[model samples]
Target: TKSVLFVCLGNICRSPIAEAVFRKLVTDQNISENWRVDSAATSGYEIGNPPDYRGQSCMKRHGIPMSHVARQITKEDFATFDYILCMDESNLRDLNRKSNQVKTCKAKIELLGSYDPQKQLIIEDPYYGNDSDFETVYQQCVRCCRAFLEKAH
Candidate 1:
């Protein structure tokens, strides 16, 4: 089985969306048994909180279900997951820094948008923006996660 951990600054906006979006893809493809998916935060700022309401609405609009509590990334995650796909550059940098501190790091850290079929390189944070911003994230995750899943399979 392959495991992936989606990460972002705070886990509320981008990571959960990507995690759930990818899980939905795996489920519909009947390959959920072969994949393990989760989401996390690069920071503890929103730890233990559910995904942002805007993110929830955005997922709902696409008929996807998302219910993840914010949690910071840990050393064990690197050793457990096959990929650590994050939202933006800041997240990538933070994750790399953290992984450097772990003695048994295993997962390959990468930017989730790197898989975007449209060639978008960054999945912008929507925490500070209006509803439209979450929709933007939703759209990007749809494209990027689809591409990622295809490659994973």
Candidate 2:
């Protein structure tokens, strides 16, 4: 099975949404068993927390099932996951920095937006933004995750 870890600054916003969207895509295609999916934070700030309420609402509106607790990326993630896809440049930078400390790193770290067919290269943080912002994030994650999954297939 292939594995992917979606990541963001706090794990309460973007990453969980991306993880949910990707999981939905694989499940829709009836290939869920072939994929191992999860999400994590670049920092431990929100560890053990659920996704942001706004983010949860967005997923609910989209009828996407999202249930994930916040967790920081561990060294084992770099070695076990096939892909480590993050939200924006900051996340990419942090992940790159962290991966360097892991001697057995094997995952391909990249911007999840890099797979976006519409070329939306950055998935912005919506923690302080309005409901519309959360909706925007959900839409972007759907597009990016769909494209990412299609490419792999």
Candidate 3:
């Protein structure tokens, strides 16, 4: 089995959405047994919090099951996951900073948007935005996750 860890500033917003979206694609293909999909935060601001209500509602509307608490990415994650896909430039920088501290890191840290077929290079934060922003995030997650699965699987 392989593993992928999704990340954002806080797990409450984008990362969990990507994690759930990717997991759903894996599950739909009956490949759940071959993947370990999870998500985490770059900051501890929302640690232990359930995904943002806006994000959860958006997922519910799309029939995507999203349930995750915020967590900071750890060195163990760097070693365990095959890929550590992040939300935007800030996340990419933060992850690289963290990974630099771990001598045995193994995951290929990259922007999740790199796989976005639509060419949306960043998954914007929706914490302070309206419901529409949450919906937009959902759409972007689907686009990127779909392409990511195809390339990786």
Model 3 weakest 10-residue run by lDDT: 144-153
Please list the C-alpha lDDT of all candidates, in the order they appear: 0.91, 0.94, 0.91
* Candidate achieving the largest TM-score: 2
TM-score of each: 0.97, 0.98, 0.97
Q: Candidate 2, after superposition: displacement of residue 43 in Å?
A: 0.3
lDDT of 2 by residue, 17-134 (tens): 9999999999999999999999999999999999999999989988999999999999999999999999999999999999999898889999988988899899999998999999
Q: Which scores better on lDDT, 2 or 3? A: 2
Go through the candidates in order and give the clash count of each: 0, 0, 0
Q: After superposition, how far is residue 137 of candidate 2 from its true place, in Å?
A: 0.8
How would the candidate models be sorted by lDDT, starting from the highest?
2, 1, 3
Candidate 2 weakest ten by summed lDDT: 144-153
Clashing pairs in 3: none
Inter-residue clash pairs, candidate 1: none
lDDT score for candidate 2 against the true structure? 0.94
Measured with C-alpha atoms, the lDDT of residue 57 in candidate 1 is 83
lDDT of 1 by residue, 1-153 (tens): 999999999998899999999999999999999999999999999999999988898888889988898999988999999999999999988999999998888798999889987888998987779999999888899898999887852
